Design a protein around this ligand. Structure first.
Ligand SMILES: NC(=O)c1c[n+]([C@@H]2O[C@H](COP(=O)([O-])OP(=O)(O)OC[C@H]3O[C@@H](n4cnc5c(N)ncnc54)[C@H](O)[C@@H]3O)[C@@H](O)[C@H]2O)ccc1C(=O)c1ccncc1
Ligand SMILES: NC(=O)c1c[n+]([C@@H]2O[C@H](COP(=O)([O-])OP(=O)(O)OC[C@H]3O[C@@H](n4cnc5c(N)ncnc54)[C@H](O)[C@@H]3O)[C@@H](O)[C@H]2O)ccc1C(=O)c1ccncc1
Ligand SMILES: NC(=O)c1c[n+]([C@@H]2O[C@H](COP(=O)([O-])OP(=O)(O)OC[C@H]3O[C@@H](n4cnc5c(N)ncnc54)[C@H](O)[C@@H]3O)[C@@H](O)[C@H]2O)ccc1C(=O)c1ccncc1
Ligand SMILES: NC(=O)c1c[n+]([C@@H]2O[C@H](COP(=O)([O-])OP(=O)(O)OC[C@H]3O[C@@H](n4cnc5c(N)ncnc54)[C@H](O)[C@@H]3O)[C@@H](O)[C@H]2O)ccc1C(=O)c1ccncc1
Lengths: 229, 60, 60, 229, 229, 60, 60, 229
């Protein structure tokens, strides 16, 4: 009877999908938060059964997707979306895609959930190395890859029962240097890891909720390929 | 061949465990951390990368 | 009152998670690590201590 | 059909038991390695049913103990056995309690296993702080609390099925100073943790066996109450 | 004959001044980069000898300040200053205060230097804890406390000879949790530390320049008091 | 008494070294790292806090 | 060509600092730590290895 | 007027010498602790002037060697000395080479010192990887490479002036796995590093003495070439 919100799915090739799969094995309902740039396309593929043979599970099981909602971790609340992206070709038809809104929508439609998965990152200048990354790009990598986790927690913590768990993904480049992982993504991962502790203290003491992070090996997903090196 | 293919090849050749790392591998650990089975774990960075993080110097 | 009683009193006060740590809390984590569910993990020191290890100085 | 050898037990108030109880949930057969000195008395309680309540598995099942065997992590093979113990009232009636002997013993009675647990620690001078610990006390701690792990691995890998798993218990005192935890135990836990990596490399490349350690929080057992500071 | 630029001095009570003092002991010329909000006031105090008995050094020595320039690490280049702060009461009279400009000014006036000290941090929401820090504030802490280091390096690396050294200050809260160090400052410190490695690789390989960071104990300075807890 | 006075008092009472930490203490280490004397050190986080960072649990 | 020659070859190739590491490089650092100039440092493991320790995987 | 005891030397190609040369720049008197087995031959080279070029201090000065003494870090006191060595051709003609004996010896000939250097390592089975290392080899490594440090501190603190300093040499292999570095040396370096913290706490609170360790990079000495992998 556990419900889990996964943020960071835009196809069955990333870690999110793999996480949603394993969660389904233990029969937990799954809600997918999907980024607008690739929302409709995902819906279309799902609808035409283009993911059908990817929802398969050894034990004959077939993933159980509770819902699929448009979601953009760049916005905390509706008053945060800029007019441009607001009138943009992909976001116009859509609504309730900010962190606050989806959190509210989820609770309003299914009640309190007890699992939260942060499976996303982004950086405009990932191709450039630290030294050559601009303030703009750097702050972008941290805003999208690290702060989203904190905002995500702040709003969801309220629609989560006690003893619920939260997790996010990280990469070892935060602790040891890996040339090529630029744009400030190594910096964002280092912040995410430090924030994972600070948050564990607070969420632990005040809500009895846990939060941990997973430092994953290499996976050829859409995001990863974006590096190009 | 982009940064990522290099990373996969190197990992599969120098990691303690040789198997190809699958999304479901991170998926089952995530499932665990999310379940009550890990009720005593928190604030941690848990590695799921076939042990590559433990190495300092390669070999060949 | 023995070194051990002090440690548990301190842990139940300053640790991120307030519940009492059970021998089975470590057991469940051990179970998971001994299974194929954690086939991508190795050479790690995994903390099951209600998160106490992440703390620097007590807020008291 | 999975068998687990738990080395390091004396009562049901330790971690070995907690691990044994949880593994029973997955229906794994358990074999206990008991330090000779307390083997008989341990068998006593057991025979007289002092552990019946502690064996009830959550799942409303009875913990399946395949066997209890005398085990001493300070002896690698029979030839390592010294005269004093060979005369020790508590070792006389016993036999095949050295690491290699119990490895062969298990392998002959139940075949191969796929799970190994190192759950034992010992330091004669644990009550003294590092600076007041003799060379003998320090090395006794490392031999019993550290080298034992490496030895278990060396002799047990022969009787393990492919993809088998291994774990040991450690304490954060190896990384940060916790006054009172003396006799070189902090030293031992620091080596156990470093050895876990090196053993993982070798056991991983060569046998495809994994090894990990659990840094636990406080548990009021008996080996822990003996520290008394 | 060594010249060092110190960024992060606004009075003799912080770490910068202490660093400038010790540098003077070894007779290195010092250039102070001073934030506009407290630039004139600092000048006035210095001029009226209000720092006179603070420039004293055991060995009778008296700090040797080469120059004192207005400097704001929020701006990489002149095209970065917003019109408002540009017409602001404190910045109007001033010029060449961006990282690029001061870097250029220094080189143009004294040639290449060989020491660089980053001794600053800032966060609008330091008083609030992580969970309650806004995206705006969070990105502000990282922009001012972490990115400034990278930008600082990028521009100065060019006016620095080979074998020159760079250093910045950090706090342990990045690795272990300290409640009260909020606003995302613990997050900024974690990024600074990770960036200190990434930068060391690049600056090392391409310019033969070193960069390290110092995790300092408590000091009652203006910044520190800002925490208020 | 603000976060910082608390931090100073606690450090001076629980740190390995008891002396008051001075700006010049960080100053002389910084001077060292900046000089050629440390030509072989780089990318490091060097602690200068009277050793407080090494502790896990206090005492009194 | 002995374990040691391999290590030095690898260090002089992938380490952040390209110069050859001298016994006096460690000596100067040792000098500083044995002096009052580092009176606020203690219980630390300080790396003097041309920064090699900060690297995860070689870029080759 | 500062005296430093360097324990662990045999030639001028090691770190002990490099440390000795640099300390000479600050005009500190040096006392060498030489492993008995090579003490005579070492005195030979010296007498025959084989080290004259290696003693010239940068500053155009001669390294001031206060004394060379036989020192064996495997013996805490005279009563720890065993028969075999008591007959060992190389120990016969010598005396007062145990840790406590040289501590008293120095203290009687030159008074108190304020600097201590632990620069020695030994592992009989360094050529074998952890899993193929015997209990004897493993413990020999920890006794010689680790416990020796704790022992030096215990006996030398008595002959040190207040605020004296202490250092030892370690290797990153204790934290990350470097195959080839065997015989339990990795284990020893892991304990040496953890012990450095615990010793710093005790020595700091009680005597106000500091202790730190230097994790060095590769140096082609002699004890390093004996590893051969
Ligand atoms: N190998 C990997 O792919 C890898 C992945 N991760 C983390 O795993 C998580 C998932 O990444 P992935 O699966 O690789 O990528 P993915 O792009 O396949 O899937 C995740 C989603 O990011 C989503 N997107 C971006 N911004 C938003 C937003 N604001 N709101 C909603 N959707 C958005 C996007 O639409 C996509 O569906 C991230 O936090 C990663 O950084 C961490 C480490 C590793 C890694 O990069 C690596 C590199 C070198 N060696 C080893 C490992
Ligand atoms: N009890 C705790 O709280 C605790 C326990 N551990 C580890 O857990 C393991 C065992 O747990 P207990 O000790 O909790 O459990 P038991 O499982 O109570 O004790 C372990 C066994 O040592 C065995 N013994 C000694 N030498 C031998 C030998 N040579 N052969 C066979 N048996 C031998 C002895 O018979 C006993 O059964 C050890 O490796 C411990 O160090 C690690 C950390 C903590 C801890 O000490 C701690 C301290 C302060 N604050 C927080 C946590
Ligand atoms: N105890 C401390 O004071 C402390 C200080 N630091 C770091 O040391 C460095 C110096 O800080 P401090 O001396 O305490 O502060 P300071 O404010 O006294 O001096 C530095 C300067 O920051 C300057 N300012 C802000 N933004 C700018 C800008 N953009 N351009 C130019 N000037 C600017 C400001 O004008 C001031 O003169 C920072 O990077 C700190 O975070 C790191 C750790 C510790 C610490 O916070 C701490 C907390 C709890 N326990 C132990 C230690
Ligand atoms: N030589 C290196 O490159 C190196 C050296 N160290 C440490 O530096 C110290 C000594 O340096 P060397 O070994 O470089 O210098 P020496 O200073 O060449 O050798 C050390 C001494 O061990 C002494 N010996 C053994 N037992 C005793 C005893 N009981 N009493 C007295 N003397 C004894 C022996 O006489 C010899 O003089 C040791 O603690 C080392 O482990 C640490 C790390 C590195 C290293 O091994 C390494 C390996 C691979 N990649 C990078 C670095």
């Amino acid at each position: 009877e556990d419900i889990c919100f996964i943020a960071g799915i835009g196809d069955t090739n990333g870690y999110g999908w793999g996480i949603a799969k394993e969660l389904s094995k233990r029969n937990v309902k799954i809600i997918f938060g999907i980024w607008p740039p690739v929302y409709n396309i995902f819906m279309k593929n799902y609808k035409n059964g283009k993911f059908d043979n990817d929802m398969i599970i050894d034990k004959d099981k077939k993933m159980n997707i509770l819902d699929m909602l448009p979601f953009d971790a760049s916005f905390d609340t509706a008053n945060d979306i800029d007019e441009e992206t607001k009138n943009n070709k992909r976001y116009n038809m859509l609504q309730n895609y900010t962190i606050e809104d989806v959190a509210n929508l989820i609770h309003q439609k299914y009640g309190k959930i007890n699992m939260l998965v942060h499976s996303l990152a982004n950086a405009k200048e990932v191709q450039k190395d630290l030294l050559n990354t601009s303030r703009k790009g750097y702050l972008d990598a941290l805003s999208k890859s690290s702060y989203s986790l904190i905002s995500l927690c702040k709003y969801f913590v309220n629609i989560m029962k006690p003893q619920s768990s939260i997790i996010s993904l990280t990469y070892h480049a935060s602790q040891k240097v890996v040339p090529g992982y630029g744009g400030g993504m190594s910096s964002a991962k280092a912040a995410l890891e430090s924030d994972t502790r600070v948050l564990a203290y607070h969420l632990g003491r005040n809500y009895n909720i846990r939060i941990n992070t997973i430092s994953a090996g290499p996976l050829k997903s859409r995001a990863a390929t974006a590096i190009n090196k | 061949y982009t940064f990522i293919d290099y990373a996969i090849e190197y990992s599969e050749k120098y990691a303690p465990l040789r198997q190809k790392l699958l999304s479901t591998d991170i998926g089952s650990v995530a499932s665990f951390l999310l379940s009550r089975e890990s009720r005593a774990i928190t604030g941690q960075t848990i590695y799921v990368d076939n042990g590559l993080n433990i190495m300092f110097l390669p070999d060949d």
